[PDB]
Structures are given as structure tokens and as C-alpha cells.
Amino acid sequence: DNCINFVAMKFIDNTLYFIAEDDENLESDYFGKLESKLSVIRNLNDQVPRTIFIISMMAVTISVKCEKISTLSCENKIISFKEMIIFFQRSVPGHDNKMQFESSSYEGYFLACEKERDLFKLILKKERSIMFTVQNE
Amino acid sequence: ISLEDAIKASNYEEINNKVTDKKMAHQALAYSLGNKKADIALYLLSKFNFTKQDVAEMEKMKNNRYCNLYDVEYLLSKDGANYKVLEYFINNGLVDVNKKFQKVNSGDTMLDNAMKSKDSKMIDFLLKNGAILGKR
Amino acid sequence: VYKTHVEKDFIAFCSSTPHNVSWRDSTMGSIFITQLITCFQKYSWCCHLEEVFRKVQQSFETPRAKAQMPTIERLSMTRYFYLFPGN
Amino acid sequence: DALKLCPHEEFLRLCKERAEEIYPIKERNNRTRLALIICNTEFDHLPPRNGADFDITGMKELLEGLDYSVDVEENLTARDMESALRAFATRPEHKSSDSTFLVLMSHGILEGICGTVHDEKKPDVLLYDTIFQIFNNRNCLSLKDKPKVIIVQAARGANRGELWVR
């Protein structure tokens, strides 16, 4: 599919933002369009101060480390990062390497992303609408 | 900024500051035709008086990309946006409606471009003024 | 009347590998045409057509913004082609 | 940004030493080298190809820099592209030429390039095989034993052609 690939991440003011590749006004000489998925790539080993991403183990627990290790929580259906709830790893629809995650407490709702005009931010919502994935390798 | 970007963003101030000689008017008219900015093109066609030799010298502009490759009639017939501008050159009598293109799509006429765009208004205006196909 | 081949002395240079997309910049043109012009200006005097094309292919070896590998296809040439610029 | 030329010495040198390993090159004094560019910038049902103007300018300049008389055709349907290529294959100047170039730029699929009225329901596509057929020694004898260079800026599929590998 036509997925959005994030080359960098920015944890500022207790908030992590995902930087995407520069399209550079490059257009396709084919006819089509799609933007349903996104993924973070272990470039420079950003996936396990560089704002590294941590996935722990089925079920998973998500953490961010930018000189301050902080776990993620979805309580009250609101995303929060606390320096120290549970999500399940699931196969991405129509993908083999990608991996997505669903809330343990607030089921049916999965991790997602929105657009800060210049960056991309993490949220939680149910199946405007963009889905967060991770490459399994 | 530049003249082409000033025409694209409708920066009339820097346009008028840069638009001086009629060579500059030629270049600006070609840029307005290329970017389909009919308002700027008409404002220049009124702010300046264009002749037929003006159209020839426009055809001789190797600097202007749109005029280095496309004929002025091609630029006028490219899409419907330049329609009003076209009318000027047809009403003020500056271009032959049945002139065959010589640079790009050589042999075709403006009626051929109008047929390509599938625009009823331009086809009508051309046929009413007795436009013919090029028979390439 | 002598015997010849139906198809001979052909060469095609596609901007990408089969099944894949080729990319174009809305401000400068297509990446493939850009690099092609670059390599022709820089090397056509001392290299032949296939060598210039290999320079082009090498300039895409490491994927920068987008990934795209122009490919040679239907190559039926028996000799080398030197454009001999400036002559 | 300027085409570096080649000293006439090397011209004579290689044209004699590799007279069998290289293609014959006519003399500029009498050399009607022809080249054809076909470019579809705007379409009916498909997104426009912004930036193709620079490609046309650059390719035309480069080809005319190699003594090729360039003819450009813009916004043609697949059948019209076939007619343009067939006419280019019957032009007599080829008899006085040593090579030819065909630069074809549009949207594309695996089978071929896309005409201006293409659509997934109603395909208007010029197949590469038709291109190679029009200029073979059966339909364009004037180009027999001469290098026929075909350059195509067009997609050949829907995949991105990228992989994330360690």
C-alpha cells in the first residue's frame, strides 16, 4: 500500500512527534493515491539523546527514551506518557512485516496518528484517520 | 522574487516594477499564457499596446520556456483559461486563427487544441470566426 | 538482396524496473531525465551510450528520497555507439 | 551545464581503430539526424504531469546539441502516437542519418505508455512492442543497421519499488 514512512521522532514537552520523509514535490508518473498506514523505521537504531522507541513483551508495553524513559497510557481514552497501560500486538491488515497495537483496557480502540501540519502525533481511536504500525524484524 | 512567480501569485507591484520595455511585456504575456493566468495577461494587454510584429517577436523569444517550445497560438489554445486572452488577439487582430503550429504539434491549428481540451466555448468562438483544422 | 534480421540495433532505457513507479519533480522535471542529461553532458565525449547509461544507473544505486532503478531493455546492439559530441 | 565535446583527433582515432567495433557516424556536413520527442502533460481522467516542460526543454537542447533535428509532439492519444511514430519512420531524412532517438514521456503501465484519454475502464495505451515494431527493418528500412535509441520516462507498474532491509 501507499504508507507514510517516518524517518525520525521528536519527544518534546512530554509529547512525541513522528517526522516523515520529504516528498520534495515529487509526483508519481502512475495514476493512483492512498494514505491509510504509517510506520517507524529503525534508522540509526531508533527502535529497540536520540529519542529512541522501546517495545516490550501477544501483549506489549510502549516506552520512549530521550534521556527520560516514559511508558504510554491510554487511560480515559487519552494518550499520556509517564516516567516509569497495556496494548496487544496485532498483524496489520494486508501486511506481513508491519505490526500494529490495540488498547488492553479500552478495546476496539487502536493506536493511531494525526497531523500537526508539519509533523505527526500519536493518538488513540476506533476503526482524519491514520493508523500506526511497526516493522517486525 | 521573480516575474513568473509574481504572475503566479498575482504580485502586481513587483510585476509593474519589473514590467517596463515591450520585450518584458512579451515575456510576461508568454508567462501569463503558460501559467494560465488570464487576469495578468489581460492587464498587460491593456497596460500595453500589442502589435502583430509584437506577436512575431514573442515567437522569437528563446528565453521564455513557453515560447521557446510552444507557439503563441498554442499557448492561447492550450486550455480554456486563456479564452478571454484569445478573444483579444482575435478581436484586436494579432494572430491568424488558422495558422498552423510550427514548433510543438507542428501542423495543427488552434482548433485542434480546442478539440483536445473538449471545450465548447472555445470551439464555438473559433468556428464562428471560421476556424479550420490543420490536417496533420 | 541479402539476409538480415527483422529486429536489430535497438536499445531501450526505461526510467524504472518492471512493475515499479518512476518519479518526477514538479519543479525541475523527472529525476531520470535530469540525471540522464547530467551524465550526457558530463561523459558523452569520452564514453559510449551504454557507458553513459551505466553512469545513470550508478547514480541511482543508493536510493535517496525515493527508490528508482532505470533499466535497459530489448538490447539488440552489435557494436558500441559513440555519439562523438562536438563533431 | 554545458555539453563537453570531444577532440576531433579521438574521433579519427577510434573511427579507424574500432571501425568494426563501433557504429558508423556520418559527417556533419551532410547529416540529417532526426529525433522525436512525444510528451503527454495533461490528460482527461488522470492527474497532470507537472514539470514535464523542463524535461522537454532539456531533452530538446541535449538532442540538438548532438546535431539531431528534434520534433516535439504533445498530448497525443495512443492511436495518434502510433501515427506520429509511423510518420517519423517514413521520413526521408533518416536515409541521410546515422542514428535516431525517441523520447516518450507520459504515465505508464507494464505493457506500455499512457495516452491522453487513457482510463482503467477504457485503456488508451501505446505498447512498447508497437514502438519496436514500427522501427524494425521490416517497416523502417531507412534505419536498418543504425542505432535506434528509445528513452522512456514513465512508470511501469503500481508498486513503490522500495524495501526496508537491515
Side-chain angles (χ1 to χ4, degrees):
Chain A
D1 304 5
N2 193 69
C3 308
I4 295 88
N5 299 178
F6 291 124
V7 193
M9 44 202 325
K10 273 188 177 303
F11 185 59
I12 91 180
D13 313 301
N14 194 4
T15 324
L16 173 67
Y17 312 115
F18 298 120
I19 313 180
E21 329 192 352
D22 189 1
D23 288 0
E24 306 180 2
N25 305 117
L26 291 175
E27 303 175 0
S28 163
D29 273 350
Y30 182 73
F31 40 99
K33 53 182 180 183
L34 173 60
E35 279 190 307
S36 181
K37 301 165 187 177
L38 62 97
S39 71
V40 182
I41 323 158
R42 195 203 46 183
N43 300 163
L44 310 179
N45 295 1
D46 296 354
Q47 296 179 298
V48 181
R50 284 307 309 267
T51 315
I52 66 178
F53 209 6
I54 298 90
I55 301 180
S56 319
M57 282 72 88
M58 53 181 69
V60 287
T61 63
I62 277 184
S63 323
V64 185
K65 175 182 175 183
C66 185
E67 204 184 347
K68 41 189 178 304
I69 175 171
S70 302
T71 318
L72 155 69
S73 174
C74 64
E75 197 72 7
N76 316 116
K77 297 180 179 181
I78 299 298
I79 293 307
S80 60
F81 293 163
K82 304 180 179 183
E83 170 175 327
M84 288 139 66
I85 41 168
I86 316 295
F87 286 72
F88 312 123
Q89 58 171 54
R90 314 199 167 278
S91 292
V92 170
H95 273 111
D96 45 65
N97 51 359
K98 316 299 188 305
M99 274 272 211
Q100 66 173 125
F101 316 110
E102 181 186 353
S103 167
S104 69
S105 297
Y106 306 107
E107 309 83 351
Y109 292 63
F110 300 60
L111 281 197
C113 298
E114 206 172 353
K115 281 76 168 289
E116 196 59 56
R117 307 171 185 181
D118 185 56
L119 299 178
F120 296 72
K121 199 188 311 183
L122 181 73
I123 51 182
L124 167 79
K125 58 187 177 191
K126 200 181 188 62
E127 278 290 301
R128 163 163 40 247
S129 183
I130 319 87
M131 259 281 197
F132 174 72
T133 73
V134 175
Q135 181 176 1
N136 174 68
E137 198 194 51
Chain B
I1 56 182
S2 63
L3 168 62
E4 195 170 356
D5 288 1
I7 298 179
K8 294 167 68 175
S10 307
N11 183 7
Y12 283 84
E13 297 79 358
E14 288 299 329
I15 290 175
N16 296 311
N17 177 75
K18 299 165 187 296
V19 168
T20 52
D21 47 316
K22 276 219 299 181
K23 267 180 170 178
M24 189 73 68
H26 299 345
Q27 290 272 357
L29 182 64
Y31 283 132
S32 313
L33 291 176
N35 307 281
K36 309 169 187 178
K37 304 304 294 183
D39 303 3
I40 318 297
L42 291 176
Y43 171 79
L44 295 160
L45 288 172
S46 56
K47 189 187 172 190
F48 283 67
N49 182 245
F50 290 70
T51 85
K52 286 187 178 62
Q53 176 65 14
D54 289 1
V55 168
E57 295 172 2
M58 283 201 58
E59 293 286 2
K60 271 60 167 186
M61 293 193 305
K62 187 197 173 184
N63 179 25
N64 184 279
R65 47 196 285 251
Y66 298 101
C67 265
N68 171 58
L69 287 194
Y70 308 117
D71 301 69
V72 176
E73 304 78 356
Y74 194 99
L75 298 167
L76 295 162
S77 50
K78 180 60 179 179
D79 202 356
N82 309 274
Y83 177 86
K84 311 176 185 176
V85 187
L86 169 67
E87 291 187 322
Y88 181 88
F89 291 90
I90 300 304
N91 295 5
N92 205 258
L94 298 184
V95 296
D96 184 11
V97 57
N98 291 318
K99 183 224 181 181
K100 296 172 170 52
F101 304 156
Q102 308 192 46
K103 302 176 187 176
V104 62
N105 290 334
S106 304
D108 288 359
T109 62
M110 315 187 311
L111 190 54
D112 290 309
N113 285 9
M115 296 296 303
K116 285 184 182 174
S117 64
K118 297 190 182 177
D119 179 289
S120 179
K121 195 177 189 178
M122 187 175 295
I123 290 172
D124 296 1
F125 176 75
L126 287 178
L127 293 185
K128 175 189 57 184
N129 301 131
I132 76 179
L133 303 168
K135 281 83 67 174
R136 230 289 184 175
Chain C
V1 172
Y2 73 132
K3 180 185 290 179
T4 46
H5 313 77
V6 185
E7 173 180 344
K8 180 194 153 193
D9 312 298
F10 268 104
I11 177 181
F13 197 9
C14 297
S15 52
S16 70
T17 56
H19 300 62
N20 291 316
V21 168
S22 70
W23 294 101
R24 165 185 42 82
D25 178 59
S26 64
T27 72
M28 297 179 55
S30 302
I31 314 302
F32 171 63
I33 303 299
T34 294
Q35 305 298 322
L36 192 70
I37 297 178
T38 294
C39 299
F40 267 82
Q41 289 163 342
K42 195 175 179 63
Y43 299 97
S44 299
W45 52 283
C46 56
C47 303
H48 57 71
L49 187 77
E50 307 84 307
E51 274 171 336
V52 184
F53 290 175
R54 190 55 52 93
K55 294 280 189 175
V56 170
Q57 293 177 299
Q58 179 210 342
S59 66
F60 292 80
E61 172 181 317
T62 55
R64 220 160 300 171
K66 304 278 186 180
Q68 175 176 341
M69 174 47 65
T71 60
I72 305 182
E73 283 266 351
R74 273 234 203 185
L75 182 51
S76 324
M77 292 196 303
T78 73
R79 303 171 172 175
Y80 284 107
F81 188 14
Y82 282 103
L83 283 171
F84 292 132
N87 301 291
Chain D
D1 192 61
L3 173 68
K4 293 196 58 181
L5 312 185
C6 178
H8 191 67
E9 197 296 297
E10 320 311 310
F11 182 69
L12 314 183
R13 169 188 188 182
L14 307 194
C15 289
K16 173 259 171 198
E17 300 171 357
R18 317 185 197 182
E20 322 77 5
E21 328 167 9
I22 66 185
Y23 279 106
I25 301 300
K26 296 278 198 300
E27 311 168 2
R28 178 162 180 171
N29 314 307
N30 281 4
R31 192 168 65 182
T32 66
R33 273 180 179 180
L34 271 180
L36 169 60
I37 303 180
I38 302 179
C39 185
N40 291 6
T41 59
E42 304 166 4
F43 302 78
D44 277 1
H45 318 144
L46 311 98
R49 290 185 64 258
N50 308 2
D53 344 335
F54 314 103
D55 284 351
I56 306 177
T57 58
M59 290 303 308
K60 194 179 195 305
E61 184 180 2
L62 184 62
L63 290 173
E64 278 173 335
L66 313 166
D67 199 66
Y68 290 102
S69 299
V70 186
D71 294 0
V72 178
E73 296 276 349
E74 199 184 48
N75 281 69
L76 307 188
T77 73
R79 182 184 296 182
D80 293 1
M81 301 175 80
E82 293 187 20
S83 294
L85 299 165
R86 291 180 197 278
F88 194 70
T90 65
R91 286 195 67 188
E93 303 82 350
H94 286 305
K95 302 183 181 181
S96 167
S97 183
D98 57 353
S99 58
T100 196
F101 279 72
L102 310 180
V103 187
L104 312 180
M105 299 160 298
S106 161
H107 294 296
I109 66 179
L110 183 69
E111 291 75 13
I113 203 180
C114 284
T116 51
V117 295
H118 177 66
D119 204 326
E120 304 181 11
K121 46 179 180 182
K122 180 186 296 181
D124 186 65
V125 167
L126 164 66
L127 306 183
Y128 301 110
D129 185 19
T130 312
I131 305 165
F132 281 77
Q133 162 194 133
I134 293 175
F135 292 84
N136 62 0
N137 299 345
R138 190 201 307 270
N139 304 290
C140 178
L141 263 180
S142 52
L143 285 179
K144 182 189 66 178
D145 293 356
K146 300 180 190 182
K148 287 160 270 205
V149 183
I150 302 174
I151 304 177
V152 176
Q153 164 58 49
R156 293 211 288 173
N159 308 3
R160 306 176 64 112
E162 306 178 341
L163 280 182
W164 297 114
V165 174
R166 50 187 173 183

